[PDB]
Homo-oligomer: 187 residues x 7
């Protein structure tokens, strides 16, 4: 419903204010675009905070890890902002913002859960695949444990199945630091 | 294909007039575009009113809530205008405008109803998805109750099934404030409204 | 598909002359473009006439009503022109032009008929949907009665089924005012 | 992929020469473009002739009648040229050129015939659709009769079935005035 | 995608050199575009020869005839060049170049054959359609005869089925005049 | 999407360097562009060499022959480079570069084989089609014979089935002149 | 959906900083773009380093070798960077960077394995295709052996089936040299490594 300009382009305008938008299912194409922008912003300044607006239902694990690693790698402080929802890999990126700079609008929703996937072929191949998704699951569990400050035991139990959370529950859990407060209505 | 030009882009031009269009099914891409525009407009002025033209059959709940939260979070007064129809999440955004600034043309139609969805998997997973969908229902119900000032009892009873409303019925319900016939006519200071 | 560029594009060139083109099926997408243009033109001048060239088989009801309401809302005189055809919601918009400013080329055709749609689900939902479409029907009937000055009875009888009209019949019915005459 | 950029574009350049192209099937979008160009050219000048290059297999009747009315409505002399073919509604447009200004290249072909359509639903609706298509047929017949100067009887006989014509045969029938080889 | 731009677009720049490209299947869209270009190049210069590069598997008969007639109409001399292949209507355009100015590269291939199509409906309509394609067949045959100087018997026999020709075989047949290796 | 822009489109940029890229399946569309670019570079200068980078699984015979004839037509020396692969018609173009200027990267792979096709219709039509492809087969064999300097007997025996070659086997065969890991 | 326009297109903007992005499945199309960009950066400067960002599940073997050979052909040193994953042909391009300039972030994943494909037709044709894919297999094993410094036996054994490796396991294997945590931090001359 193909895109504003003002002025460039509405999204390019936000980038100008060091804002990167992560919207929709995460895949290599999205990861690639987001990473390109983050690296660009660090290039303009490796000290100024970078803002990440997040509204995603999740996506490809490795694609999500690529964004995650890039966020952690650049020197810039990173503020994450949950808009609408941050599910699956989306909540990992939200929780991955610089401590004390992870926010959420009051009506957004967060969701975490173990990864899913597929394996087919000879028994030998199945075994190799099952081992890899298992390493992937433990990897994700440690990352969440690290940013939420929760123990592995808690992470493991909480991610066995889909675990939905309100902004407040997410703050308590350790995924975000601030649940934004709406100003008074002008009427 | 479609879009004009004026003097960007017909839509970009109205944006320069602080007009934001919410048209068609609401989803993540739509929400993203609308949100980016609202933030941009507040940036230009956190005082100047913002106009939101709404003609939508509804869409994704979380996407709707992302727009709603942004509307409530920015400081600007927001005038919502219902044109054609504001159904489901569309009517939530309509009712979410600044009190006293929620409009509709005389032949638009409003519709509100509980959310819908799907669940699939083991019984445990289905129980988890049901619990979540019920939370969404209650959340949306509290939001409507707040902006329409109706009691939860009234909301629950009105949204159990599809509930269509004329602009005036929506005004009475608390979804809208004014049904306009014309903007300020020659010599008049105020717009002409549909009288009850 | 559409377009020559000019001196922007041909359609944008017409817009400069305060002409808005309603071509093809009417849906939320077309209504949004048309309304955007109407609003734009009113901001340019809320007194100068605005021309709406119409060649449409019809479209979505609420989408049509959106355009209809916008045409009535703005302060500008609205001149309507039937080119090719104005069927269903297309004829409602033709008839909604300012009285005395609704035109049609001599070989165009007009068509009116009640609305159509679907209903599905439990009996309760079907009843709710049936009730809604009947309201849309009545609502459209009142709008046609208002602009054609025909009684509701006449409108009801005339729209129960597809009703085609030549420009002259449409003029007599009250859908338009002037049937254009070709030069020598 | 397809359109050349000129000194934009190749077609826009021809428009500068008061040349309008009617190519391919005729539908609502094609009519709108064609019509907008015609009106534009009139405002540019209501005296200078307009050239309409026609190569179409035909198309939607109301869309064709839209172009036709517009051609008759503007004051400009309209020179029509049949290139490749002018079949069905395409041929009605060819014949609607200003008298004495309807042309055709040597190997083009013209075709005229009554309208075709469809209809389904209740009998009441089928009757309504039949009555309407019948009106369209008579309407088109009278227009061919007018511009060809043939009797209604002759038109009725000639269009009952697909009737193809060479440029010379179309000239004699009154569809066009001249078959040109070179300028 | 495709399209390098220059110093516009690669093809647009070739037009500057009076080079019109006839590529791929020939249909109404390709014909109109080619005709516009031909006309265009006539304006700027009504004497300067136009170069038409051809690599086509063929296409719609009327569409090809539209291009053919325009080639004959304009006064500009026309050098046709067979690149890759000139089959069906493409071979007709090749042969329609100005005498002495029809060329082919060493490894191109030419092909000619009668037209194909389809008839459908009541017997009456099938006869009408059959008569019409038979006319198109004889019309095309007469055009090949004119430009190749072959008798009608020769053409009818050579086109009853697909007939492939080497550049030299095509020159001998009268489809083209020169087979160049270098400029 | 898959686009970069400099200084414009990355390819338009390389063309400024007199570099023509033959990528993907070879068809009439690919050939038209290639030939257009070649003709452009010759006009810019008929003495300056042209660089054709080839990465293709092959394609339409007549399309490949069009590019082949153009290469031999223009006066410019043409350096061919096999990148990734030069299969079927692609290998023909690689071998058609100016003698002594046909290159290949170390790990590219070359492949040659007789033409393939289809045919349906009456027995008479099948015979005509069969006769035609056999002719295309002989024509290609002669072309390879000419540029590789191999006898027809050798070409016929080598192309009866898909024949894969490493850059060196291809040089030895006469399809290219140098295999380069780094610039000389 | 599309790409934000800085100051133009983000990727073009990075290409101006001598950065080439190899993302998604590798095919002739992606290989052409990459090779075109690499050659462009050489024209600009056949001396200034070139950065290759890699996040790919793999792709067409010949397409990947086209990129590989180009990387080796250009004079300028190439720094490879793995984010997300560098699987199959992707891991080959990663290992093909200038020695000492092959990197990865902490959570990327690497994978190597022998090539796959299909064969069909007369027995004679199947044999020809079988022989070709086996040559391809050995060709790739040689390339890996050369850049990882592993013996052909280790390579053959490790690639028979899909072999996944963490960045640190890949560094030990010889696919990459450094696993970065941060580029040079405030006051530090060198980047921080795992
Ligand atoms: C933390 S696991 C994330 C993987 C992702 N989950 C569902 O949306 C898939 O897709
Ligand atoms: C209570 S609102 C539920 C969401 C809404 N329903 C379907 O159209 C959409 O939009
Ligand atoms: C009563 S008008 C209902 C809308 C209309 N129906 C179909 O032709 C369209 O246009
Ligand atoms: C009587 S003309 C009807 C219009 C025509 N129909 C089918 O060929 C097209 O064109
Ligand atoms: C006698 S030529 C008829 C037109 C030709 N036939 C099919 O390939 C095409 O082109
Ligand atoms: C003798 S090469 C014929 C062209 C080739 N055929 C099948 O692969 C393609 O590629
Ligand atoms: C030894 S690399 C073989 C090519 C590779 N295989 C599948 O993942 C692709 O991608």
């Amino acid at each position: 419903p193909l895109i504003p300009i003002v002025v460039y382009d509405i999204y390019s305008r936000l980038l100008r204010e060091r804002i990167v938008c992560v919207m929709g299912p995460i895949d290599d194409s999205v990861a690639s675009l987001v990473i390109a922008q983050l690296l660009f912003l660090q290039s303009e300044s490796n000290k100024k905070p970078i803002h990440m607006y997040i509204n995603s239902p999740g996506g490809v694990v490795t694609a999500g890890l690529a964004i995650y690693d890039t966020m952690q790698y650049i020197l810039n402080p990173i503020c994450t902002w949950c808009v609408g929802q941050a599910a699956s890999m989306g909540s990992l990126l939200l929780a991955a913002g610089t401590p004390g700079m992870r926010h959420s609008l009051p009506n957004s929703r967060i969701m975490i859960h173990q990864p899913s996937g597929g394996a087919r072929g000879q028994a030998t191949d199945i075994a190799i695949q099952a081992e890899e998704i298992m390493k992937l699951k433990k990897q994700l569990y440690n990352i969440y444990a690290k940013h939420t400050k929760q123990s592995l035991q808690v992470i493991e139990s909480a991610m066995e199945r889909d675990r939905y959370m309100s902004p407040m529950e997410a703050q308590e859990f350790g995924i975000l630091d601030k649940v934004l407060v709406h100003p008074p209505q002008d009427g």
